[PDB]
Design a protein that fits this description.
This is part of a larger assembly, with chains A and B.
Chain A (H helix, E strand, L loop, with lengths): L1 E7 L11 E6 L1 H11 L9 H11 L24 E2 L2 E2 L2 E2 L3 E5 L4 E6 L15 H17 L6 H4 L2 H4 L13 H9 L14 E2 L6 E5 L9 E5 L18 E2 L22 H5 L34 E4 L2 E3 L4 E3 L2 E4 L12 E2 L9 E2 L8 E2 L6 E2 L17 E2 L21 E4 L13 E2 L12 E2 L11 E3 L9 H4 L2
Parallel strand pairs in A: 8-23
Antiparallel strand pairs in A: 1-2, 1-7, 3-6, 4-5, 6-7, 9-10, 11-22, 12-15, 13-14, 16-21, 17-20, 18-19, 21-24
Chain B lengths: L3 H9 L1 H5 L7 H7 L8 H13 L8 H16 L9 H15 L7 H15 L2 H18 L8 H7 L6 H22 L17 H16 L5 H14 L10 H7 L5 H14 L8 H12 L7 H12 L8 H4 L10 H16 L5 H17 L5 H17 L4 H17 L4 H10 L2 H17 L7 H11 L5 H11 L6 H17 L5 H10 L4 H16 L2 H6 L2
Helix pairs in contact in B: 4-6, 5-6, 5-7, 6-8, 7-8, 8-10, 10-12, 12-14, 15-16, 16-18, 18-20, 19-20, 19-21, 20-22, 21-23, 22-24, 23-24, 24-26, 26-28, 27-28
The chains are: A alpha+beta, B mainly alpha.
PDB class: transport protein
Keywords: Complex, transport protein
Entry title: full length AP5 complex bound to SPG11-SPG15
Amino acid sequence: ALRAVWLIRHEPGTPLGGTVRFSRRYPTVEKRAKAFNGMTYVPVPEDGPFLRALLFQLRLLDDDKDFMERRDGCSRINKTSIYGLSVGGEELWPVIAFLRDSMIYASVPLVEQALSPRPPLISISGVSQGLELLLGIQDFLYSSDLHTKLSQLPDLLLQACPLGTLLDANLQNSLNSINSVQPQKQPAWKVKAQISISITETVKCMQYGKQDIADTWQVAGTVACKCDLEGVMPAVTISLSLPTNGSPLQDIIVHPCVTSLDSAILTSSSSAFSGPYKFPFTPPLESFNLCHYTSQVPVPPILGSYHMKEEGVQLKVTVNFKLHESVRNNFEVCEAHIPFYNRITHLEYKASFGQLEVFREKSLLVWIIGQKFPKSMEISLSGTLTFGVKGHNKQPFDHICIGNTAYIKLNFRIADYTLTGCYADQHSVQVFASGKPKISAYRKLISSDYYIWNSKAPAPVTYASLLP
Amino acid sequence: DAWAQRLGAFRASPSAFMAGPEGEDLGRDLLSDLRSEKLSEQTKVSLLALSMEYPAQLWPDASAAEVAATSLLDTLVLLPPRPSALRRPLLLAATTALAAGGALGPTSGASCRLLPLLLGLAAGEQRPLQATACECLRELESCKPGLLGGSLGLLRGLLGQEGPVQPLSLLLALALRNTLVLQSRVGAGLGGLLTWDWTLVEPEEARELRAAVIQLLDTSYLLTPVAQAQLLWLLGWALRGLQPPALFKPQLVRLLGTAQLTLLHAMLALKAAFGEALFTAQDEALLLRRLTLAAQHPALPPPTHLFYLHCVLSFPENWPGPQLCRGLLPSLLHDPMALLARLHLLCLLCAEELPSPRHYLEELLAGLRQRAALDGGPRALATLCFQASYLVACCLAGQPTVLTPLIHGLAQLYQARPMLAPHFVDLLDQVDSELREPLKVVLRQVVVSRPGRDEALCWHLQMLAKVADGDAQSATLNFLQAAAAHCTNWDLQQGLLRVCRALLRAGVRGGLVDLLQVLARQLEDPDGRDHARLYYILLAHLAAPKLGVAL
């Protein structure tokens, strides 16, 4: 049971910081707060003071202050996204917030006990409820329409949170139920079997390449499906055919609508069988994800290196790559961008393949390798980058790149070739119903974080990487 | 624009406009034109939405609230018999006014006319109206305990009949909890409640309640995750002390295979309330593993990660290994606010002291220091370093082996980056004495090591004031004497006498009769010189206690 909800778009530079698009207060819950809290009650302020305080605490409003001990103090540690606001000489508690793509989301829930000792957050249901509603709004607004989505929001959530208690957290469902008008226990989030499983395995790899230090790669994957079929209770559970060379499923977690996860999925953390993949679901009007899997394969797909001998102003980046044979030689965008944090005036380069176009800022020369690597599978750049006046703040200041330490930011992508081996199968359909599954499977590859870490310089290291 | 400009000044500030001259009759007008025909659909909708949103600002007194209740009820009954869009919002607005005005009660005509109406309507835009009425009834029952405990038999019988699953389910669950608590408080039980009373404001039951819980669980398959969480939370409240939980065991075990932010918290609070009755000795291990996994799983946003990172540390034990500590231990690939959620794990692991956890802690804190020393970065980096230092200091006051490197690193970090003066002052003002003293010594040594010709003097003097005592006299006096010539602005000229006042409070007597004298005689601003004169007089002419009582 919340007390109020917000959506404040992030507006840098504006003294107010933004323009509220949603401010609904439920006063039944405020009277309940009086009755429950008692002497520890602190009222909910108006929109203006709330915005000021929340932007102050979120460190999003004029962070140039030298030191504010109410925010930057060594004694006020925020290990969770549930902040505690201080409005009108009263410590408001608890207040939730998070930021993504310049869109803030907030709420103040109800606690059914006195606040004289701050109750542990492993007890207040309202924190979880506020967070989940805010996440649902975030998914709805920026799903994929500039203002027709933000205009209908006040008429949207009212159908979902009328009087301080939520009903459904999917705002698309509020839109479906409001714009468009169930004698059985049909799920409360639902208003020719075709399924569009868009698997996506992003290969992030701090490859490093030392002796004791392990080469750190891990692939983040997901499955987005939908049993968007007619009937009463159609059954379509799809099978993904990882080969014998491929490993079983790894790092499985599921959707809120999903039924459960197998005891192996609980065990196999960071049955071990390639089949039969029996994944219970509940046919949604949403897009059910029967699992999100981060599969492992021992073979890295791409290997790399980097030396930058700081011979004065000679950042000779003698790079050297290694395209494993398992990678198909057709890259949609293999832009091996090479940002130059903490440092091109004179591109005295020697490009083996593809142009090294210094960009107009002359700060980071994004060497576009282009589409395919040479037959030598190696680029190089012995560029006498005679940089001019030393840029100390103009250049992109990245702290994970200091001195001779850096790595090439390869923003490389690939269509329908990832590092896992996903292959959805349809001929093995077993179900207690009948139908024709139109399983439009797919895949992809993205550079989540592919830093070919310079082995001629120190690199940040995780825990198990140094562990033998 | 009849009412748009009218509501603009109110939704700009409710309490400000309602305290103005025009807001005295605002509620009067709004109640008046409720049954009117000159107001279009949109104006009526907007006015009724405001009547929803702020029932506390226009009808404060109980009598006014009752009058508004009867007026709204009248205009709701007297509506034209054509399909329109004022049916549900009117009932909900009347419910809001009655509930938040405090005028609700069995001994009032307005409540006695509203409650049967909502009961009949919700009993069964028909479906949206029924849902809205059911929500209104449940909310009213929440306001006054037992207020809606009249038609429990009706819902029990008609569970398979018309009526949406979620509203009747939630209302039934809330009514069960409130009624059973009240009646058992009296000393009796349901007493046939399974088949509109107002007296609650002031064996077979086991089987009936078992039927109730199985029915609720069966109907909960349609419940959305958020409402499901609150249902299970309040049910775990109710049935902790008042049939085994093996009825709900399959559902709970299945739901723990998820990672949604609400079902996980429902499971966590269910185990933290029910305690160790249903939890196995090893099921706690699987739950801990999954919470730790979800604290760093890429497929989830940062908020879920940090929520479960806070949940794991304060995880509720049933009956009060290293690999789990290696699935969440901090790294430098962690965004600033997700490491401090993981620093306690490393302090716990390294306290009882694979590279040596002290070595990895040294490398991690060294990376944080190197980030902090980078001139030109944001303050988040320094804040990270100092919060991490505080957590380790409080957690590891008692092992000099890991603490000597920490003290040395902090001293070097101060030497590299003098702009971090306030952070150290706050840390010194918080940490316990076992760490307050050696760090004080080493940081004093660092600050007084330089001759005193730097441009960071305005940052040195703050630590000097925050640490000066009677241990190392001559070095401090020499450093301060050298720094006297490098103070041209009032800020440093006040930090310096802050140092002298700290010495004052410490009690040092000899030589200070010359350090304070030279400061008073050789500064720039008159105010600092007078400050020094006063403090020098106080030290020279006071006995030891009277200075603490008269200075």
